[PDB]
Structures are given as C-alpha cells and as structure tokens.
Motif scaffolding. Structure first.
Motif, PDB file in Angstrom:
ATOM      1  N   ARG B  69       0.851  -1.189   0.000  1.00  0.00           N
ATOM      2  CA  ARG B  69       0.000   0.000   0.000  1.00  0.00           C
ATOM      3  C   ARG B  69       0.888   1.242   0.000  1.00  0.00           C
ATOM      4  O   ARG B  69       0.701   2.145  -0.804  1.00  0.00           O
ATOM      5  N   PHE B  71       3.848   1.435  -0.907  1.00  0.00           N
ATOM      6  CA  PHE B  71       4.570   1.430  -2.169  1.00  0.00           C
ATOM      7  C   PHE B  71       3.734   1.991  -3.322  1.00  0.00           C
ATOM      8  O   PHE B  71       4.234   2.724  -4.164  1.00  0.00           O
ATOM      9  N   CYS B  74       3.769   5.794  -2.984  1.00  0.00           N
ATOM     10  CA  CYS B  74       4.947   6.481  -3.505  1.00  0.00           C
ATOM     11  C   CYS B  74       4.886   6.541  -5.031  1.00  0.00           C
ATOM     12  O   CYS B  74       5.239   7.557  -5.634  1.00  0.00           O
ATOM     13  N   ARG B  77       2.375   9.291  -6.110  1.00  0.00           N
ATOM     14  CA  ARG B  77       2.941  10.599  -5.837  1.00  0.00           C
ATOM     15  C   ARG B  77       4.104  10.833  -6.792  1.00  0.00           C
ATOM     16  O   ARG B  77       4.341  11.955  -7.234  1.00  0.00           O
ATOM     17  N   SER B  78       4.815   9.767  -7.130  1.00  0.00           N
ATOM     18  CA  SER B  78       5.942   9.896  -8.034  1.00  0.00           C
ATOM     19  C   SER B  78       5.474  10.270  -9.433  1.00  0.00           C
ATOM     20  O   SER B  78       6.071  11.128 -10.089  1.00  0.00           O
ATOM     21  N   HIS B 112      13.853  11.465 -12.363  1.00  0.00           N
ATOM     22  CA  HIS B 112      14.154  10.824 -11.096  1.00  0.00           C
ATOM     23  C   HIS B 112      15.224  11.519 -10.299  1.00  0.00           C
ATOM     24  O   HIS B 112      15.090  11.660  -9.084  1.00  0.00           O
ATOM     25  N   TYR B 116      14.295  12.953  -6.519  1.00  0.00           N
ATOM     26  CA  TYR B 116      15.051  12.730  -5.292  1.00  0.00           C
ATOM     27  C   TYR B 116      15.706  13.995  -4.752  1.00  0.00           C
ATOM     28  O   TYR B 116      15.859  14.133  -3.543  1.00  0.00           O
ATOM     29  N   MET B 137       5.828  10.397   7.758  1.00  0.00           N
ATOM     30  CA  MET B 137       6.131   8.983   7.972  1.00  0.00           C
ATOM     31  C   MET B 137       7.586   8.857   8.404  1.00  0.00           C
ATOM     32  O   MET B 137       8.492   9.239   7.659  1.00  0.00           O
ATOM     33  N   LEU B 142       9.335   3.025   7.967  1.00  0.00           N
ATOM     34  CA  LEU B 142       9.644   2.605   6.618  1.00  0.00           C
ATOM     35  C   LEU B 142      10.683   1.492   6.614  1.00  0.00           C
ATOM     36  O   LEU B 142      10.566   0.532   5.849  1.00  0.00           O
ATOM     37  N   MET B 153      13.827   3.071   0.934  1.00  0.00           N
ATOM     38  CA  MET B 153      13.986   4.481   1.242  1.00  0.00           C
ATOM     39  C   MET B 153      15.264   4.878   1.967  1.00  0.00           C
ATOM     40  O   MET B 153      15.714   6.016   1.851  1.00  0.00           O
ATOM     41  N   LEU B 242      14.219  -2.345  -7.747  1.00  0.00           N
ATOM     42  CA  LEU B 242      12.881  -2.494  -8.281  1.00  0.00           C
ATOM     43  C   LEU B 242      12.764  -3.811  -9.045  1.00  0.00           C
ATOM     44  O   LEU B 242      11.780  -4.538  -8.889  1.00  0.00           O
ATOM     45  N   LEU B 258       6.113   5.280 -14.932  1.00  0.00           N
ATOM     46  CA  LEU B 258       7.361   4.948 -14.254  1.00  0.00           C
ATOM     47  C   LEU B 258       8.091   3.831 -14.975  1.00  0.00           C
ATOM     48  O   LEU B 258       9.315   3.829 -15.069  1.00  0.00           O
ATOM     49  N   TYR B 262      11.901   3.963 -16.639  1.00  0.00           N
ATOM     50  CA  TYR B 262      12.953   3.021 -16.248  1.00  0.00           C
ATOM     51  C   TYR B 262      13.411   2.096 -17.388  1.00  0.00           C
ATOM     52  O   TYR B 262      14.554   1.642 -17.402  1.00  0.00           O
TER      53      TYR B 262
HETATM   54  C1  LIG Z   1       6.847   7.678   3.025  1.00  0.00           C
HETATM   55  C2  LIG Z   1       8.037   7.424   2.144  1.00  0.00           C
HETATM   56  C3  LIG Z   1       7.595   7.469   0.722  1.00  0.00           C
HETATM   57  O1  LIG Z   1       8.065   8.676   0.124  1.00  0.00           O
HETATM   58  C4  LIG Z   1       8.339   8.565  -1.258  1.00  0.00           C
HETATM   59  C5  LIG Z   1       9.426   7.688  -1.773  1.00  0.00           C
HETATM   60  C6  LIG Z   1       9.708   7.574  -3.200  1.00  0.00           C
HETATM   61  C7  LIG Z   1       8.899   8.343  -4.165  1.00  0.00           C
HETATM   62  C8  LIG Z   1       9.144   8.255  -5.649  1.00  0.00           C
HETATM   63  C9  LIG Z   1       9.425   6.831  -6.209  1.00  0.00           C
HETATM   64  C10 LIG Z   1       8.091   6.004  -6.327  1.00  0.00           C
HETATM   65  C11 LIG Z   1       8.225   4.573  -6.851  1.00  0.00           C
HETATM   66  C12 LIG Z   1       8.712   3.514  -5.969  1.00  0.00           C
HETATM   67  C13 LIG Z   1       8.845   2.157  -6.479  1.00  0.00           C
HETATM   68  C14 LIG Z   1       8.484   1.848  -7.865  1.00  0.00           C
HETATM   69  C15 LIG Z   1       8.005   2.898  -8.725  1.00  0.00           C
HETATM   70  C16 LIG Z   1       7.879   4.240  -8.209  1.00  0.00           C
HETATM   71  C17 LIG Z   1      10.138   7.124  -7.456  1.00  0.00           C
HETATM   72  O2  LIG Z   1      11.191   7.748  -7.522  1.00  0.00           O
HETATM   73  O3  LIG Z   1       9.593   6.669  -8.622  1.00  0.00           O
HETATM   74  C18 LIG Z   1       7.815   9.221  -3.673  1.00  0.00           C
HETATM   75  C19 LIG Z   1       7.531   9.337  -2.227  1.00  0.00           C
HETATM   76  C20 LIG Z   1       6.444  10.222  -1.780  1.00  0.00           C
HETATM   77  N1  LIG Z   1       5.358   9.452  -1.177  1.00  0.00           N
HETATM   78  C21 LIG Z   1       4.191  10.051  -0.668  1.00  0.00           C
HETATM   79  O4  LIG Z   1       3.950  11.287  -0.674  1.00  0.00           O
HETATM   80  C22 LIG Z   1       3.289   9.115  -0.133  1.00  0.00           C
HETATM   81  C23 LIG Z   1       1.834   9.243  -0.388  1.00  0.00           C
HETATM   82  C24 LIG Z   1       0.896   8.264   0.167  1.00  0.00           C
HETATM   83  C25 LIG Z   1       1.379   7.128   0.999  1.00  0.00           C
HETATM   84  N2  LIG Z   1       0.503   6.166   1.538  1.00  0.00           N
HETATM   85  C26 LIG Z   1      -0.006   4.926   0.751  1.00  0.00           C
HETATM   86  C27 LIG Z   1      -1.544   5.175   0.606  1.00  0.00           C
HETATM   87  C28 LIG Z   1      -2.159   5.306   2.009  1.00  0.00           C
HETATM   88  C29 LIG Z   1      -1.448   6.459   2.870  1.00  0.00           C
HETATM   89  C30 LIG Z   1       0.040   6.233   2.948  1.00  0.00           C
HETATM   90  C31 LIG Z   1       2.840   7.013   1.249  1.00  0.00           C
HETATM   91  C32 LIG Z   1       3.772   7.994   0.693  1.00  0.00           C
END
Ligand SMILES: CCCOc1ccc(C[C@@H](Cc2ccccc2)C(=O)O)cc1CNC(=O)c1ccc(N2CCCCC2)cc1
Lengths: 259, 265
Positions: B69, B71, B74, B77-78, B112, B116, B137, B142, B153, B242, B258, B262
């Motif tokens: 979830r 994941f 992220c 949001r990504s 990307h 970051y 969070m 995490l 992370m 990944l 995404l 990649y």
């Molecule tokens: C809390 C730590 C997470 O932070 C990261 C980490 C990485 C990224 C970008 C990644 C996404 C990714 C990962 C794996 C495979 C494809 C894409 C990236 O660089 O692509 C955003 C984010 C930003 N995430 C959020 O704002 C976020 C939003 C919702 C969320 N939740 C899941 C849904 C219920 C509530 C909790 C968690 C996190």
C-alpha cells in the motif's frame, strides 16, 4: 589571496611532471603523429610486439587473459605513481594515516581512468611508456567477457578528451579526486574537505586563466566525476564476474597476492 | 552585480524561481516550516507504526497489504511529481524548442534525479513529509517494512541528510534542477550542441545565484555539482532494487509512466 592559488597550481604541476613519466603533452605528440610506437592490431602484431619490444606487462595462455593481466600489472604500477603524487599535495601527509589510506584506496581507480584518457584517442591506447599502441578494435575483438573490458574506458576517454585539458589542468583535478570527503570509512572528514576546497578554488582559477574561452569548463569537468565513478563501478562488476567465472586466471600464489 | 551579463543571469534566476513556485505545490520553505514544528496549523499527523498508519487514513486526505500500500502510494505521488517537473521543464528557456525526441530523452533521464533532489526538501534524519505535508512517515517505520521494501527508502534518507547540509533554498534548487534537465550527455541525444549551450547558460546563472545567496559558503557551486553523482547512484540502486521487487511480487503492478522511464535506462 589569489597568489597562494597560483603557487599551489604550479606546485601540483611540477610534482605531477616528476611523478608521472608519460605526460599528456608527450602522449599527445605520439598519438597525432607529430612527434614511432609499435602498433598492436592483431595476434601476430601482438606476438611480434612481445618479441621485438619487451613489454614488461607481458611476462611468463590465452591472449585475452594475458592482456587482461597486463592491464592489472600496469594498474598496480600506476597506483605507486599516484601514491607518491598524493604525498606532495599540501596537507595530505598531515592527515590521519588511516584516512590517507582510505582516500588512496577509493581514489586510485578514478585517477587511473582519468589519466588513461590522456593515452587514448578514439582509435587506441598507448602502452608501456608509449612504446606501443594497442588498437581499440583489437581489444574490442577479444572474446567475451574481455572484448568489452576496455571499451567503456574508450567511450569515457573520447568524452573527457573533448574538454582539451592539459597536464597543468589535470594535476589539480587529480588532487581534487584524491581529497574526496565522501569516501567510506573516513574518520576526520573536515580537514579533507578543507583541502579539497582549497584545491577546487585553485582548479577554478587555473581553468579560467588557461581556458578563458571555454565557458563553464570547471562545471563541466566536475560533472565528469559522474562518468568516472560509473566507469569504476562497472569495472568492479566485470572484475568479479571474471573471478566468479574464468578458470584460467590463476597466477603464481605470490603474484595474486601482489594484486 | 554590475555588467549587463550578470543582469541577464539574474533575470533568468528570477524567471526559473517564479516558474518553480508555480509548478511545485510544496516548496522547501513550506516543508521546513512544517518540519521545524514552529506553527500550530501546519502540524502533520505522524505515522510511525501500524495503528498510526491505520489512523492516518482518517486524518490525512490521501490493496490490503501494508508494505505494498505504502509502495503504491509512492508510485502515485511519483507519477504526479513527473507531471510537475514536466511542467517546470517547459518553462526553461529553450527547452520546448529542442527536437521533440531529445525533449523526451532529457525528461526520461532527468525526472528521477530531480524527484530525489526535491524529495530531500521534505526530509530530515527522522522521516519524510507525505500527502502535501499533512502527514509525516518516520524513517524507522519505513525501515521496518517487509523485505525487500524495508530498505527502499534508506539510501534516499542518507542522500537527503547530506544534501540538506548544503542548506540550499528554493531559488537555488530551481536553477539546479534546470541544470539537471539540460544534460548534454544523456544516452541517445540527437543534438547535443543546443542542449549544452542552454546548460552553460543555466550553469552561469546557478554559479552567480549561489555566490550572491551564499557568499560565506565557499565552493558551494562545486560541492552542489558533485552531488549530481549521488543522484545517479540513488537512481541506479532504485532501478535494480525495483527489478527484484517485480520478481518476488508478481502481484504488484508498476505504473506505466514509471515503467517507461525506467525501461532501457
Ligand atoms: C513515506 C516514504 C515514501 O516517500 C516517497 C518515496 C519515493 C517516491 C518516488 C518513487 C516512487 C516509486 C517507488 C517504487 C516503484 C516505482 C515508483 C520514485 O522515484 O519513482 C515518492 C515518495 C512520496 N510518497 C508520498 O507522498 C506518499 C503518499 C501516500 C502514501 N501512503 C499509501 C496510501 C495510504 C497512505 C500512505 C505514502 C507515501
């Protein structure tokens, strides 16, 4: 305060000339023809190369393997030249001995490939003091996984070389690579970054005084750092692959210790 | 501070910062304000365990499997971040004028590294702001995630703590991410000349910006540039981490955008 910058540059240059026998100015003259090197472009020419000239990197077996090992022998040799050079960098020897070891341990590879570009053009590489020229194609023709061993360095070389840096520019760039405070295990990061900071300034002025027309050469050179580490990381990968595989790589127990 | 050239570079910095604020809802200035918990209205809900996560669903706006979830969260949001950066990119003088293919190649390799870079603005050593700053969070929560999620992370937190040490502000970042986008050495570029000409100009802007904004921070420019290697690294580790995911988690879908970025990276 711009006086101490010029002094450091000249110092690094002078020390670089003394520590490294084959400079870029020299290698360049040999490579462009405007000086001749024995040319190795295939098996027979390699064979004759060993007989005519005594390439120390080829002592007493599959050719791909002896060429690979020769590369390692020369690298080991280079590591001493770099280590000596490092000692002349103001402040280096006054650092914690473990950090000095750490800096060289993670820095020599980057420097090796940085200086190797000085001996390469898109067509080949100078070996054994420039006495020879090994063809890019011949190297790229070695059977896997040796055929793509050098190619990654050539690709880097072509790019790095377009910046047209000269020995005096490289002396300072090399010192900057050595004083990297992000190496794993360092115990006292501050003095290292303080010296690199002094080296970065010295490098910036050098590039502006030596290449007033090349805009942002400093930024561009610093950016090449990314290409270097990717080259090293990738190199480390292939190196273990050759170790996990390949059964004809074993050398004398003492030789393997030496590398 | 004198010549017309400097003036031109300041104008560029202003243009880029202005577009940056317009394209990114959550700036570093806002993120920091929420993080230093100074206010009484910017307070985020903290998720540091299951019961918290459970209650966050009710607090923050915002598949039944904790690790996955978070994941999928992220990923979404990504994907959204890719859209903001893409919008920012278009504002960079000259970007939309380059060959369309190169425009794609630059975004493909640049989003990307930028994601970051900006993600660090939302981080501190203990955790990361999420959902537009409404939530926080922790790093430990995490890291307690089922393998191989438990360490996806961590390397980003490590980068962030170091990068944040530079203490860059939004006006500096706007130019820096612009420089990242306009990289002439991206694999597959058709016309490398026009891109370098644009980056050189952006680099001059960044150089002056850092000197005027951080006069006491010696060689910040070079130190910031060297950080671009930490980014490449972070991206690589991620891509590989990944590939392991999809093999142990055949039931986890990766967003198409995404996946395209990649692919053959
Ligand atoms: C809390 C730590 C997470 O932070 C990261 C980490 C990485 C990224 C970008 C990644 C996404 C990714 C990962 C794996 C495979 C494809 C894409 C990236 O660089 O692509 C955003 C984010 C930003 N995430 C959020 O704002 C976020 C939003 C919702 C969320 N939740 C899941 C849904 C219920 C509530 C909790 C968690 C996190």
């Amino acid at each position: 305060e711009s006086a101490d910058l010029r002094a450091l540059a000249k110092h690094l240059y002078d020390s670089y000339i003394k520590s490294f026998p084959l400079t870029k100015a020299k290698a360049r003259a040999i490579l462009t023809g405007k000086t001749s090197p024995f040319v190795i472009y295939d098996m027979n020419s390699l064979m004759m190369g060993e007989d005519k000239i005594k390439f120390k990197h080829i002592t007493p077996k599959e050719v791909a393997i002896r060429i690979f090992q020769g590369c390692q022998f020369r690298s080991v040799e280079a590591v001493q030249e770099i280590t000596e050079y490092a000692k002349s960098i103001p402040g280096f020897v006054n650092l914690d001995l473990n950090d000095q070891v750490t800096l060289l341990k993670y820095g020599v590879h980057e420097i090796i490939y940085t200086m190797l570009a000085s001996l390469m053009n898109k067509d080949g590489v100078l070996i054994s003091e420039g006495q020879g020229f090994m063809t890019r194609e011949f190297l790229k023709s070695l059977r896997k996984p040796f055929g793509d061993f050098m190619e990654p360095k050539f690709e880097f070389a072509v790019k790095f070389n377009a910046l047209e840096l000269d020995d005096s520019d490289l002396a300072i760039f090399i010192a900057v690579i050595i004083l990297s405070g992000d190496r794993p295990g360092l115990l006292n990061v501050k003095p290292i970054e303080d010296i690199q900071d002094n080296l970065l300034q010295a490098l910036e002025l050098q590039l502006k005084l030596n290449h007033p027309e090349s805009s942002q050469l400093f930024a561009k050179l610093l950016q090449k750092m990314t290409d270097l580490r990717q080259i090293v990381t990738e190199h480390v990968q292939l190196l273990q692959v050759i170790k996990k595989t390949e059964t004809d790589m074993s050398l004398h127990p003492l030789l393997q210790e030496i590398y």
